């Protein structure tokens, strides 16, 4: 290998090293192909060099270069750039592409040249190259170490001095190969994947076996020669009979109910008031700056005149309750004094308390605080259990009722052309007439508005205490626009990094409900009595006190992102009702939408009175499934996720009994434990567990 590194020129060494590295073999190992490729590249470069094309088109054998070359070298390059060279040449002229890669290209004759440097007879290798490379205009030009040549059709385009230098250099290299004693092995030499383990990985492989094996190759020989002879049956006879999947017969008449937890009553945890909310309205708003939320808030605020000096009538027991009073007074004073489209509050002390400014501990390093006597890790206690209270059922009752306003305004659609689009338009209009005046649609509008405004304010004003009015816009039955104000939200600082990062806000919501009639519902609220208004009724007209429910609440980026998308509750309700319509339409072989929505018979069980199971119409089913999806979105929790996933199996087992499909379990007690593990303190999960118990009692009465 030292002869090839000594006699040949280093550019030929570089070309041969690139060729062998591209082909995987090595000059240090296989050196016969190394010296053969080096001699081939030497002959090809002596063919190519010192041949130029002038500014007329004649070969002037010069030694200095402003004339372009006559030959272009395609041998020795990488294969992809060589095929790029060949393809650009053939697209420059008009010639068809050859099947193999040649060695040179002559721009004078416009021809691809092929050169093979052999260690045997010139004629045999030339006839081999001719029989192989047949079917294309390739000028084969075979040389050898004998100082002779063979060409295609006896057309010799290379000049006499270049061929004389080629033959002289080949004879000199043959004499230097023969005097050095390295010449016969050239005439003697004229899917193989390997993957073994190096020793550290071999010792790693020896320690990753079953325990009766010490060598990895011993284990390979065992696995390759394994024949089964009843190993499974022998270990099945040897296994204890306490490993079994015994089937317990499932019968809903004998199963127990879910055990709902004990403790204090569950409290309200929604981000705004639901059945207890009170709105100040402006009918057909047309004030200056209408559309801007603070302008609508001042316009709806001017409709109320019965303000007083606000007093605390229900205290938040863990809070500084006079701070909430000062917050409402500062907010009202700043609304009366504002001159713009937005409102940022001063960072007073009571507002800083209510928004939790400075409540994060100072972030330090561990060695700087190692010796603190009460440096403890964070409290990771389970949630405290709560009892089911009566208010969440009445909230769900009011959420599925009809109001007097349309709350959903849908965007425009493309025009109906197909008949199925007209069928879909009639069915969608039936569902919209059954669902747009529902109170859960009003809750959708409140939540989408609040979460949209809170997310935009949290992104754009991270250091500001922005005031966000709680505004919906509805239409009456006469079609008149109405703007409703429910109260205000004061945002805190909102440097929201993680998706679970909390922005604290203060909710201040109008109400007519006295909180002392149901105080366990309001354990997070400080309720102020802010005024009096005249409610006019059928008996007389009475001055009711107007209350303000003030609360510190918090939301995250992911929570208000999901609150922004609460209109998909409509899709869930409409999809279920439409699948129920289409199931009857496939049977009756006609469209069943108008018989469903028009025939006002009570034929769907949707409730219970003391007189038994109550039935309703399909529009009641629409509003009830809508309110269920809305309350799933409002009271979303991991408890609800676990409860729904685990109680679905009990529902499917009851359905399997009612289909006479003979249901059976393997561990019903573990299933009941997995259901009851998820019922902790969330009022909606407690109501859903009570609902499962009521459905189970109704099934047990329907059977027996």
């Amino acid at each position: 290998e030292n002869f090839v590194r000594t006699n040949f020129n280093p550019m030929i060494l570089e070309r041969a090293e690139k060729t062998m590295k591209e082909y995987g073999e090595n000059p240090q190992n296989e050196g016969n192909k190394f010296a053969a490729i080096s001699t081939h590249m030497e002959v090809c470069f002596m063919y190519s060099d010192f041949h130029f094309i002038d500014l007329e088109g004649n070969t002037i054998v010069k030694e200095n270069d402003m004339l372009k070359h006559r030959f272009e070298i395609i041998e020795g390059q990488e294969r992809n750039i060589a095929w790029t060279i060949v393809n650009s040449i053939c697209n420059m002229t008009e010639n068809s592409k050859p099947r193999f890669l040649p060695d040179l290209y002559d721009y004078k004759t416009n021809k691809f040249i092929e050169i093979g440097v052999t260690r045997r007879k010139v004629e045999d290798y030339y006839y081999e190259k001719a029989s192989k490379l047949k079917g294309e205009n390739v000028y084969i030009h075979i040389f050898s170490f004998d100082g002779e040549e063979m060409a295609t059709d006896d057309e010799y385009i290379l000049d006499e001095e270049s061929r004389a230098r080629i033959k002289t250099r080949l004879f000199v290299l043959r004499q230097e190969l023969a005097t050095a004693g390295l010449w016969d092995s050239f005439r003697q030499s004229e899917l193989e994947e390997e993957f073994s383990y190096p020793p550290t990985f071999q010792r790693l492989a020896n320690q990753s076996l079953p325990p009766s094996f010490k060598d990895y190759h011993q284990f390979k020989a065992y696995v390759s020669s394994f024949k089964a002879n009843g190993n499974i049956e022998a270990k099945l006879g040897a296994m204890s009979e306490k490993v079994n999947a015994q089937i317990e017969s499932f019968d809903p008449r004998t199963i127990r109910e879910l055990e709902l937890p004990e403790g204090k009553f569950c409290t309200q945890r929604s981000k705004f008031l639901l059945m207890d909310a009170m709105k100040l309205s402006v009918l057909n708003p047309a004030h200056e700056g209408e559309g801007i939320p603070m302008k609508d808030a001042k316009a709806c605020l001017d409709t109320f005149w019965g303000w007083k000096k606000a007093t605390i009538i229900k205290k938040h027991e863990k809070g500084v309750n006079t701070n909430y009073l000062m917050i409402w007074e500062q907010l009202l004073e700043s609304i009366k004094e504002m001159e713009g489209k937005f409102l940022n509050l001063k960072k007073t002390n009571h507002l800083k308390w209510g928004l939790g400014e400075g409540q994060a501990p100072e972030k330090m390093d561990f060695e700087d605080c190692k010796e603190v006597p009460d440096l403890f890790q964070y409290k990771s206690e389970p949630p405290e259990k709560r009892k089911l209270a009566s208010w969440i059922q009445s909230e769900f009752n009011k959420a599925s009722e009809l109001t007097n306003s349309n709350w959903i305004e849908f965007d425009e659609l493309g025009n109906d052309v197909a008949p199925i689009e007209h069928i879909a338009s009639r069915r969608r209009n039936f569902f919209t007439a059954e669902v747009s005046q529902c109170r859960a649609s009003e809750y959708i509008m409140k939540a989408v508005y609040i979460n949209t405004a809170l997310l935009n304010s949290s992104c754009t004003a991270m250091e500001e205490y922005q005031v966000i009015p709680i505004i919906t816009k509805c239409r009456d039955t006469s079609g008149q626009r109405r703007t409703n104000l429910y109260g205000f939200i004061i945002k805190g600082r909102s440097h929201l990094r993680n998706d679970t990062d909390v922005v604290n806000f203060i909710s201040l919501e109008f109400s007519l409900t006295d909180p002392r009639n149901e105080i366990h519902k309001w354990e997070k609220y400080c309720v102020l009595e802010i005024g009096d208004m005249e409610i006019r009724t059928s008996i007389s007209t009475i001055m009711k006190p107007v209350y303000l429910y003030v609360r510190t609440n918090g939301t995250s980026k992911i929570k208000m992102k999901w609150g922004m998308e609460m209109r998909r509750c409509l899709l869930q309700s409409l999809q279920q009702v439409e699948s129920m319509i289409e199931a009857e339409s496939a049977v009756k072989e006609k469209d069943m939408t108008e018989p469903f929505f028009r025939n006002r018979e009570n034929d769907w069980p949707i409730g219970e009175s003391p007189q038994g199971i109550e039935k309703g119409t399909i529009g009641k089913v629409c509003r009830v499934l809508l309110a269920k999806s809305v309350f799933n979105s409002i009271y979303a929790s991991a408890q609800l996720e676990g409860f729904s996933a685990e109680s679905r199996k009990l529902l499917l087992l009851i359905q399997a009994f009612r289909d006479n499909l003979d249901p059976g379990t393997f561990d019903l007690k573990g299933l009941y434990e997995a259901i009851e593990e998820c019922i902790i303190n969330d009022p909606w999960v407690l109501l859903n567990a009570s609902w499962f118990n009521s459905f189970l009692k109704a099934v047990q009465l329907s059977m027996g």
Partner: protein, 749 residues
């Protein structure tokens, strides 16, 4: 009347209203803080189900390793990891006997795919643990960091470009006693002060590098539905991804031809397979033959399958193949048998009297006073301290990262294959479908005690091979109804629309892509998930509203006020044909049921003003960012269940095909030099694509450097444009002199 929606199931069957049991309109549960406790819980549980195994100290890493294979048989119905090797080999032998030629053809296809795979196939992946940085990186930059550290340390077989030479370099790098990596630290000096970050070359030991190469980075699974408590997941490093690739390629070629395998098929194909197995198991041999179906779940699936069993499976499937191929496929269970788990970010400590908080790492958990912790964490750390090896926990049993999904499917399909009538010759037989964790099992017999004996036979055979059927979550009934991966079969598959409800809404790519994705999602759910026509119309309306509010592109005649109102209003007033404006430009919605399959630019093309159409479809626009043909019109969607999918949409590239800005937190960290490295890499790839325009379409191959290839291309393009009238002779001479100057600069430095 107190309203109860569950009473709807008194009239409607539960499967026909099953969407009222999926509360998927609210936010999913998320974890806060670390996942160190979930990771330590996983390691403690994995060692508890295998505790009657044999402990051995590893000679190469020092890790305490538990071996439950061929251990004592289980004595109760608790989850156990005592899989028997001979039972596994008997089941794989039965799977080979029932499918003759399957293993040999899968092995031959894997052999043919090994010789054609390049290293850049490892760029396709999510967050890979980077042993160079001891953190998570994207898969391509983790691969680039590994290749760079390997080339700096003398491992350069991967310069051939194929994957198997990179794998040879990975295995040969374990012989290094001093692998040299580069870290980072800040240097602040100075009357105004400037500060930058300088590199520092560290040298790992042999044990340090071997522990880093076998490290899984653990974190918490977020946004998972159906559970009360969070679980931990793991991502592996770059040293094992290439071996896991070939093992999963073999197991995918096996699972594609098993009709009892639920992998790797979509929803409709899995429903077709379940319908076929229900039709086969209800053809009835006699007339009084019983048929029962187990709606099954497997408890602690990943914590009880063992890498040594997977090693035996790989060596038995490949029986009769070349030994290099057997060793190469055996590397990945061997490296999973010696794996260690990184224990997360640690914990936060709080001082209430001094009002401070601090973050201790998981490396500090081995040497810290136990008085800081609560009782659960204190018990976890005391149980975990004997498994500790250099900041990581030793985790020999179990499959924590869970990458052998198709191999676990092969193991479950072998137990399903055992229950043929011609193999068992019993009074019972079984069949079903296996999709990794989930399984359906139809058991047929003549009496109910035959059904119980078949259930016990299946359950004990699964216990012999480390498969633990969940008795709390499984139930049995007569064949006609079951559930499989939230697919509810009640004499036919029913619709479960609530599973697809998070996919409705704005996808979050750009305006054009999200319009295409939203209409395609509505169309796909109309075809597959039985979305009705009225609900599809309302879904179009709700998507258009969420799209207008998300991108602030309300209609030009409306009276809202955003940052984009005045500009869209100017475009609205200057437009003659308003119906040709896109929704992103303040135009009307064109979509109904019949045209959801038509992109919005084509649907409005004949209605556009020609000037607006020329501005909107201008190819010389600075907003669009074409990178690669294979990534064109691709989004990554994350469904409510399952891993993230690649979704193809149909969209004309306009000025609404822009890209959002990147996260900028790296500028405050030590890794801000990665930005400069990425910028230089993008500039080099841009000038290479100036020389080689097909590189954006077909990946160019070559062992020569980029500069040499560009110089050769410049030389041939000059000679081809000189002899064609395109380029003069002085420009040719200037190009050749510039190439010679570039060669001189290359030879200089």
């Amino acid at each position: 009347m107190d309203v109860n929606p569950m009473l709807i199931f008194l009239k409607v069957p539960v499967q026909n209203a099953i969407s009222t049991t999926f509360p998927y309109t609210g936010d999913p549960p998320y974890s806060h803080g670390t996942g160190t406790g979930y990771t330590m819980d996983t390691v403690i549980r994995t060692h508890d189900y295998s505790s009657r195994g044999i402990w051995k100290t590893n000679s190469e890493t020092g890790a305490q390793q538990l071996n439950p294979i061929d251990g004592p048989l289980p004595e109760d119905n608790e989850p156990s990891g005592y899989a028997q090797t001979d039972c596994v080999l008997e089941l794989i032998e039965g799977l080979d006997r029932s499918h003759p030629g399957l293993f040999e053809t899968a092995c031959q296809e894997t052999i043919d795919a090994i010789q054609q795979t390049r290293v850049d196939k490892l760029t396709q992946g999510r967050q890979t643990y980077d042993w160079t940085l001891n953190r998570n990186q994207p898969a391509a930059t983790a691969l680039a960091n590994t290749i760079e550290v390997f080339r700096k340390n003398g491992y350069k077989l991967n310069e051939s470009g194929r994957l198997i030479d990179f794998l040879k370099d990975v295995l040969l790098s374990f012989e290094n006693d001093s692998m040299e990596v580069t870290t980072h630290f800040q240097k602040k000096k100075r009357m105004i002060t400037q500060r930058t970050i300088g590199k520092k070359r560290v040298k790992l030991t042999k044990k340090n590098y071997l522990i880093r190469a076998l490290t899984l980075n653990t974190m918490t699974k977020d946004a998972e539905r159906g559970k009360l408590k969070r679980r931990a997941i793991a991502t592996p490093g770059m040293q094992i991804r290439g071996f896991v690739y070939f093992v999963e390629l073999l197991a995918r070629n096996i699972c594609e031809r098993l009709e009892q395998s639920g992998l790797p098929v979509g929803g409709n194909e899995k429903k077709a397979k379940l319908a076929n197995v229900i039709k086969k198991m209800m053809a009835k041999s006699t007339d009084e033959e019983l048929s029962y179906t187990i709606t099954g779940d497997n408890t602690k699936w990943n914590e009880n399958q063992n890498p040594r069993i997977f090693l035996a499976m790989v060596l038995r499937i490949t029986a009769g193949q070349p030994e290099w191929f057997r060793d190469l496929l055996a590397v990945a269970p061997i490296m999973f048998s010696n794996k260690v788990a990184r224990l997360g970010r640690g914990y936060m400590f709080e001082s209430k009297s001094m009002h401070l908080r601090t973050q201790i790492s998981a490396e500090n958990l081995s040497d810290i006073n136990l008085r800081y912790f609560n009782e659960d964490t204190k018990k976890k750390i005391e149980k975990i301290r004997h498994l500790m090896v250099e900041g990581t926990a030793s985790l020999s049993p179990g499959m924590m990262m869970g990458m052998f999904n198709m191999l676990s499917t092969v193991l479950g399909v072998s137990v399903l294959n055992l229950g043929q009538r011609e193999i068992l010759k019993r009074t019972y037989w079984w069949d079903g479908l296996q999709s990794s964790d989930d399984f359906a099992l139809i058991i047929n017999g003549h009496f109910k005690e035959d059904i119980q004996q078949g259930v016990n036979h299946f359950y004990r055979t699964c216990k012999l091979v480390g498969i633990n059927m969940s008795q709390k979550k499984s139930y049995i009934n007569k064949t006609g109804t079951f559930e499989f991966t939230s697919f509810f079969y009640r004499y036919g598959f029913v619709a479960n629309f609530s599973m697809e409800l998070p996919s409705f809404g704005v996808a979050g790519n750009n305006e054009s892509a999200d319009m295409s994705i939203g209409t395609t999602v509505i169309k796909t759910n109309m075809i597959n998930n039985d979305l009705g026509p009225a609900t599809a119309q309302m879904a179009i309306q709700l998507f258009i509203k969420d799209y207008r509010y998300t991108y602030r592109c309300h209609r030009g005649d409306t009276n809202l006020e955003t940052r984009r109102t005045k500009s869209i209003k100017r475009l609205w007033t200057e437009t003659i044909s308003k119906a040709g404006l896109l929704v992103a430009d303040g135009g009307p919605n064109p979509y109904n049921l019949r045209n959801l399959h038509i992109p919005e630019v084509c649907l409005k093309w004949s209605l556009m003003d020609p000037d607006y159409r020329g501005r909107l479809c201008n190819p010389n626009n600075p907003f669009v960012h074409h990178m690669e043909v294979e990534s064109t019109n691709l989004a990554v969607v994350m469904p409510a269940h399952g891993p993230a999918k690649s979704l193809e949409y149909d969209a004309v590239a306009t000025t609404h095909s822009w890209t959002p800005k990147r996260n900028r937190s790296i500028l405050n960290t030590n890794q801000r030099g990665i930005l400069e490295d990425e910028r230089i890499y993008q500039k080099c790839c841009q000038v290479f694509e100036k020389f080689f325009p097909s590189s954006t379409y077909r990946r160019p191959i070559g062992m020569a450097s980029m500069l040499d290839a560009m110089l050769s291309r410049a030389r041939i393009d000059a000679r081809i444009d000189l002899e064609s009238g395109r380029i003069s002779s002085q420009d040719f001479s200037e190009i050749t002199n510039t190439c010679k100057a570039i060669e001189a600069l290359k030879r200089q430095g």
